Design a protein around this ligand. Structure first.
Ligand SMILES: Nc1ncnc2c1ncn2[C@@H]1O[C@H](COP(=O)(O)OP(=O)(O)OP(O)(O)=S)[C@@H](O)[C@H]1O
Ligand SMILES: [Mg+2]
Lengths: 43, 178, 65, 154, 88
């Protein structure tokens, strides 16, 4: 029973939330990949 | 030790299979010219025998046999694409899914052919996909006067059927507009 | 027989160095412990020699003899 | 003898109906303003290639003509992107926010969720992975209108 | 070859199927070539192949024989490795 404008506003809010989630997932994956490639020794 | 126990010579692994002899010649040529090879086989025990043959000949290899854990598959892909020493990457045609991006190699060797040419096409596309900057050569090894010739004939018949059915028509919007 | 044979450094370590002076061998693909039944062709003379000039103990006395 | 004639007439009838459908699709696609009828979705928030835009137009034409179809684009051409663009177009212009079901292989499920979040963050994405208790918990209250827009499942 | 039937099938499938090959779409694409190399069997492989083809005529069906022949063509070590010989 909702109208199009309400759907658009809810879409805006959910878009903000999903962008936050996507950014967090990208950061976690990039950090994990960067940490995997590390390899060092000791003097 | 030599008088106490005798092991079969590692050389006899290649002597007992003509595919292995032809593959040894082909792999030596490919390494001389400076390429990287993907070897696809339908059997994991064949993967083990290929491990023995490659280690005997000195070709460093990585393995994805369809039983490896998923988190290990991406690591193997990244290592193979990053490391230039790894000559070969033995794989099972039915495994790997579609998310594997093996653009590092430039040569594909099918140790044995699948009944379904789509699976071989996916194995080829594993290396021929977009973003790959070298010519791709596909080598198919077939045993003379054996069932493998029947397998290749069946695969070619299926490819011809696909070309008749789907590739025959343009199936694009250009036909509707024209 | 207590016969130990070293076949090689595992293939997984074949990339660590460029010149190691090692022969690499793939990982065994069966079980760790195997039992195989085989047929041995021997003669009575072979048994006599094995029990007259023993070399199965792997001790110092066998080498000395 | 009569069997061949019956099969021929049945196949002729099927071919005639299919030709009518194809003619309707051709007439729908030929509407003038290269001359792509459907604009990009305002919610799409991404750059499509030309052939992806053509595929979006074809999908919208199939939706309007009420025909189901197979998108057999070769690997890497962006079939998932085309599907997401179709859903965004329908939701924005048509109002088809309605619950859509996307059945994908389990390995590709996370990638599809990633693509939906990348292109269309507006859609309320529900993912159906987990054990029985987790699936039942994530179901609870999903019959409510405007509770989830697209569901991904294996 | 009856091209009319093929055209009728194309007409039937036309309104529903959309196909695009990378050749016509992604132009900046490297070429591909396919080579077929014939290989001969070893003495061990030939003996095992003949033994299986003899087992065709007698409990093993054509499918089991087919799989065994595929394994033989792959490598005879899939059946039994060459023994490690040691004293009794
Ligand atoms: N317009 C675009 N802009 C940026 N990336 C794009 C675009 N179109 C496609 N891609 C990328 O293309 C890749 C493949 O997308 P998909 O739609 O999954 O292709 P595909 O047809 O599904 O391949 P398969 O068959 O699933 S392996 C993804 O990494 C997308 O990010
Ligand atoms: Mg896909």
């Amino acid at each position: 029973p909702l109208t199009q404008e309400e759907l658009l506003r809810e879409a805006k809010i959910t878009e903000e939330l999903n962008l936050r989630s996507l950014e967090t997932y990208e950061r976690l994956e990039a950090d994990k990949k960067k940490q995997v490639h590390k390899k060092r020794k000791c003097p | 030790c030599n008088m106490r126990t005798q092991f079969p010579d590692l050389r006899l692994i290649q002597y007992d299979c003509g595919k292995l002899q032809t593959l040894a010649v082909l792999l030596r040529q490919l390494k001389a010219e400076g390429h990287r090879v993907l070897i696809f086989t339908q059997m994991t025990r064949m993967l083990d025998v290929l491990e023995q043959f490659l280690t005997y000949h000195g070709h460093l290899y990585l393995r994805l046999d369809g039983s490896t854990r998923v988190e290990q598959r991406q690591a193997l892909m990244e290592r193979f694409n990053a490391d230039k020493r790894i000559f070969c990457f033995i794989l099972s045609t039915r495994s790997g899914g579609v998310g594997v991006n093996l653009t590092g190699a430039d040569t594909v060797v099918f140790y044995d052919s699948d009944w379904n040419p789509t699976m071989d096409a996916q194995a080829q596309d594993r290396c021929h996909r977009i973003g790959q900057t070298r010519d791709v050569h596909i080598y198919r090894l077939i045993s003379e006067r054996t069932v493998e010739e029947n397998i290749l004939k069946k695969a070619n018949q299926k490819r011809m059927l696909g070309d008749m059915a789907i590739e025959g028509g343009n199936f694009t919007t250009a036909y509707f507009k024209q | 027989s207590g016969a130990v044979k070293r076949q090689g450094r595992c293939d997984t370590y074949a990339t660590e160095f460029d010149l190691e002076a090692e022969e690499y061998v793939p990982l065994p693909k069966g079980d760790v412990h195997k039992k195989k039944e085989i047929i041995q062709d021997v003669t009575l003379h072979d048994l006599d020699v094995a029990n007259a000039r023993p070399q199965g103990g792997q001790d110092i006395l066998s080498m000395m003899g | 003898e009569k069997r061949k004639k019956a099969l021929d007439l049945h196949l002729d009838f099927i071919v005639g109906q299919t030709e009518k459908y194809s003619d309707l699709l051709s007439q729908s696609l030929n509407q003038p303003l290269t001359q792509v009828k459907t604009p990009i979705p305002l919610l799409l928030r991404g750059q499509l290639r030309e052939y992806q835009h053509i595929g979006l137009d074809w999908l919208v034409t199939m939706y309007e003509k009420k025909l189901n179809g197979i998108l057999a684009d070769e690997m890497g051409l962006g079939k998932t992107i085309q599907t997401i663009s179709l859903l965004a177009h329908l939701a924005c212009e048509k109002g088809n926010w309605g619950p859509h079901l996307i059945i994908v292989p389990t390995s590709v499920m996370l990638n599809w969720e990633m693509e939906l979040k990348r292109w269309c963050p507006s859609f309320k994405i529900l993912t159906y992975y987990g054990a029985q208790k987790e699936r039942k918990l994530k179901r609870q209250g999903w019959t409510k209108p405007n509770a989830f827009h697209v569901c991904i499942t294996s | 070859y009856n091209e009319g039937l093929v055209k009728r099938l194309h007409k039937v499938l036309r309104p529903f199927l959309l196909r695009r090959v990378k050749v016509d779409v992604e132009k900046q694409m490297p070429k591909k070539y396919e080579h077929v190399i014939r290989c001969r069997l070893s003495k061990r492989q030939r003996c095992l192949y003949d033994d299986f083809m003899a087992q065709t005529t007698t409990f093993m069906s054509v499918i089991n024989i087919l799989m065994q022949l595929r394994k033989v063509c792959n490598h005879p070590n899939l059946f039994d490795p060459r023994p490690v010989t040691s004293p009794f």
